[PDB]
RNA sequence: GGCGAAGGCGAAAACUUAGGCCAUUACUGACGCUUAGGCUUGAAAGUGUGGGGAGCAAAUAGGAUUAGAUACCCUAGUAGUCCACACCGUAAACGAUAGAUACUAGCUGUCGGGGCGAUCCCCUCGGUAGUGAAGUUAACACAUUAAGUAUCUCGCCUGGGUAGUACAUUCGCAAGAAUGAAACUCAAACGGAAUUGACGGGGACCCGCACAAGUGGUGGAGCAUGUUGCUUAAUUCGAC
């Protein structure tokens, strides 16, 4: 279903919410596409940008499992 | 990359991953044109999702 | 596309009462005609028991069983040459090839009487020394070389 | 002796190089498809890789190695037959480790076989 | 899926700014399209450039089959493999369908905005594809994101091989880019659509000693017979 802009109050950040973004990412530390996440393209790109920011923040490994 | 959920059967789950690695690693064994790279990647993705549904 | 066919062989020869000696009649056969070949086969039995006493039934069955080849080679080419991949065979091919080897090496030796050389071929095929057991050793030692490409799918 | 260490399996495009190494730096054994006398056109055959894997597994099991960390590179049934022969020869595995060479448009290998 | 003129743009973050759209019940009040002028951009690629330059490679050296391999298998190899700076400027730069607009079957849509509303769904404004009515074309299809109907403005084509060829002249050190023939020659274009069987060292396909597992084997040998080569006056003729 819809995975972003519904699990939050429309105020977007990266603190204490990656645990809610984890299940939108396969255990492969890979960003699940809109095909897998199923959210809207706005929310899919929300998830993608947040997860890639977390990767650059060492919150989630890039290609490491 | 690292796929393992069992003590011994992890290779059963890894067979499909190995086929996927074959089809995503035949691109790293030789260089080919970028336009054709994107074309083949997107075409194969659309073909696979077409057969899934 | 041809499918599996029956493996027919003429019924047992009443002198020894098994289809095995009849298949030997049929495969050691030259221009098949059972007018004279049966008397010569009776003599062959005689020379078998006279030389190094061995009941033909038991020695022949032991030789056939031990010589039994197991491996066959299928073909897959690369348009430049051909290679082989090993597969398994049933007991019918095993016994057919064993009888074939015994019969073919029975007719081809060098001593006075042809009866003597067929008897000697039986004797030397008795103890599973190489007259036809070499084929069983060779197939096992060469199909293992064709296992080289066994784990490859193409 | 050793019961848990590191082995680096390199499934070459026409071979498979298997070498058991210690985390501290030393190595236990190394066997190539050629070290057994099957070098030049038979190394590419997966059974040569399986036999090399059997050799390293049996010598390191004589060294006592039950399980091992395995960094396998190269794709195909060679990387599968290697671990199959490892398990058969008593050299068990914990999991497959993949730090595989997936470049992000990196270096250039020699041109494609055309 | 979207952004931007097509070209291009995807690890994250910050810097300056973007066009455009929804509701504008708001406002100047046709200010709307327009090219020859005048430009820049433009994948690549080549040149210089200051360094960088992992990696491999245009030519090349070799090793192999080969009819030979300057192709294809394999490794070295030069420029090049990036930004900052200039020339360069073509492309399957194509929706092979110019910019903008007036609407016009239908269905599902896909996203962004707005409305609604736990989410969600639905509708609506735009981008946004397939399906398919009618019309049209040679058909593909276009098919409401037209190729239906047209509108303002621009650029292009007037049987062909010739030939984007020489030249005037423009840009560029150059290569080339811009523009651009003529002469000779033919009666059509390797002219597009579509039919027919066929072809395939394109695809599945079914059986047939066709293959395979065989039996015996032939051409090997002695002897026959046909034919071929000669040669005769002819070894009648032919078949092939």
UniProtKB/Swiss-Prot annotation, chain A:
Molecular functions per Gene Ontology: small ribosomal subunit rRNA binding; structural constituent of ribosome
One GO-annotated biological process of the protein: translation
A GO CC annotation given for this chain: cytosolic small ribosomal subunit
Protein keywords: Ribonucleoprotein, Ribosomal protein, RNA-binding, rRNA-binding
Membrane-traversing stretches: none
Function: Binds as a heterodimer with protein bS6 to the central domain of the 16S rRNA, where it helps stabilize the platform of the 30S subunit.
Family stated for the protein in its record: Belongs to the bacterial ribosomal protein bS18 family.
Subunit structure: Part of the 30S ribosomal subunit. Forms a tight heterodimer with protein bS6.
Name of protein: Small ribosomal subunit protein bS18
Native species: Mycoplasma pneumoniae (strain ATCC 29342 / M129 / Subtype 1) (Mycoplasmoides pneumoniae)
Location of this fragment in the whole protein: 40 to 104 of 104
UniProtKB/Swiss-Prot annotation, chain B:
Family that this chain belongs to: Belongs to the bacterial ribosomal protein bS21 family.
The organism of origin for this protein: Mycoplasma pneumoniae (strain ATCC 29342 / M129 / Subtype 1)
The keyword Lyase is assigned to this record: no
Classification lineage: Bacteria, Bacillati, Mycoplasmatota, Mycoplasmoidales, Mycoplasmoidaceae
Alphabetical list of InterPro entries matching this protein: Ribosomal_bS21 (IPR001911)
Gene Ontology biological process terms from the UniProt entry: translation
GO function terms (MF aspect): structural constituent of ribosome
Keyword Transcription regulation: no
Transmembrane segments: none
Superkingdom: Bacteria
Database matches in HAMAP family: Ribosomal_bS21
Keywords, comma-separated and alphabetical: Ribonucleoprotein, Ribosomal protein
Gene Ontology cellular component terms for the protein in this record: ribonucleoprotein complex; ribosome
Name of the featured protein: Small ribosomal subunit protein bS21
Curated annotation (Swiss-Prot), chain C:
PROSITE patterns given in the database record: RIBOSOMAL_S7
GO cellular component: small ribosomal subunit
Stored Pfam families: Ribosomal_S7
InterPro entries: Ribosomal_uS7 (IPR000235), Ribosomal_uS7_bac/org-type (IPR005717), Ribosomal_uS7_CS (IPR020606), Ribosomal_uS7_dom (IPR023798), Ribosomal_uS7_dom_sf (IPR036823)
Segments crossing the lipid bilayer: none
Keyword field: Ribonucleoprotein, Ribosomal protein, RNA-binding, rRNA-binding, tRNA-binding
Subunit structure: Part of the 30S ribosomal subunit. Contacts proteins S9 and S11.
Biological role stated in the UniProt entry: One of the primary rRNA binding proteins, it binds directly to 16S rRNA where it nucleates assembly of the head domain of the 30S subunit. Is located at the subunit interface close to the decoding center, probably blocks exit of the E-site tRNA.
Name of the featured protein: Small ribosomal subunit protein uS7
GO biological process: translation
Similarity comment: family membership: Belongs to the universal ribosomal protein uS7 family.
Cystines in this chain: none
Molecular function terms from GO: rRNA binding; structural constituent of ribosome; tRNA binding
Chain coiled-coil ranges: none
Organism domain of life: Bacteria
Curated annotation (Swiss-Prot), chain D:
GO process annotations (BP): translation
Keyword Repressor carried by entry: no
Family statement: Belongs to the universal ribosomal protein uS11 family.
Keyword Ribonucleoprotein in annotation: yes
Database matches in InterPro entries: Ribosomal_uS11, Ribosomal_uS11_bac-type, Ribosomal_uS11_CS, Ribosomal_uS11_sf
Protein known as: Small ribosomal subunit protein uS11
Keyword set, alphabetical order: Ribonucleoprotein, Ribosomal protein, RNA-binding, rRNA-binding
């Amino acid at each position: 279903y819809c995975r972003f802009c519904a699990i939050g109050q429309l105020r977007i950040d990266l603190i204490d919410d990656l645990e809610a973004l984890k299940r939108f990412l396969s255990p492969y530390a890979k960003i699940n596409p809109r095909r897998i996440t199923g959210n809207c393209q706005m929310h899919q790109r929300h998830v993608a940008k947040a997860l890639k920011r977390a990767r650059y923040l060492a919150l989630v490994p890039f290609v490491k499992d | 990359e690292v796929k393992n959920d069992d003590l011994e059967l992890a290779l059963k789950k890894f067979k499909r991953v190995s086929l996927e690695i074959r089809r995503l690693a035949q691109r790293h064994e030789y260089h080919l044109r970028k336009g054709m790279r994107l074309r083949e990647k997107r075409k194969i993705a659309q073909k696979k999702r077409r057969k899934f549904r | 596309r041809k499918n599996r066919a029956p493996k027919r062989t003429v019924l047992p020869d009443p002198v020894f009462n098994n289809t095995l000696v009849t298949r030997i009649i049929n495969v050691i056969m030259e221009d098949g005609k059972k007018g004279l070949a049966q008397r010569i086969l009776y003599g062959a039995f005689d020379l078998i028991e006279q030389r190094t006493k061995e009941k033909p039934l038991t020695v022949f069955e032991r030789a056939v069983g031990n010589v039994m080849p197991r491996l066959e080679l299928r073909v897959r080419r690369i348009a430049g040459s051909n290679y082989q991949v090993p597969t398994e065979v049933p007991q019918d091919r095993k016994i057919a090839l064993a009888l074939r080897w015994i019969a073919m090496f029975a007719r081809k030796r060098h001593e006075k009487t042809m009866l003597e050389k067929i008897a000697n071929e039986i004797i030397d095929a008795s103890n599973n020394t190489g007259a036809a057991i070499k084929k069983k050793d060779d197939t096992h030692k060469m199909a293992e070389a064709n296992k080289a490409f066994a784990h490859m799918r193409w | 002796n050793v019961s848990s260490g590191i082995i680096h399996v390199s499934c070459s495009p026409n071979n498979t190089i298997v070498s058991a190494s210690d985390p501290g730096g030393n190595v236990l054994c190394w066997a190539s498809s050629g070290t057994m006398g099957f070098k030049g056109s038979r190394k590419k055959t997966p059974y040569s890789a399986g036999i090399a894997a059997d050799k390293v597994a049996k010598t390191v099991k004589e060294m006592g190695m039950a399980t091992v960390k395995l960094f396998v590179k190269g794709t195909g049934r060679g990387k599968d037959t290697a671990i199959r022969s490892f398990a058969n020869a008593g050299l068990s595995i914990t999991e497959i480790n993949e730090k595989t060479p997936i470049p992000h448009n990196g270096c250039k290998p020699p041109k494609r076989p055309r």
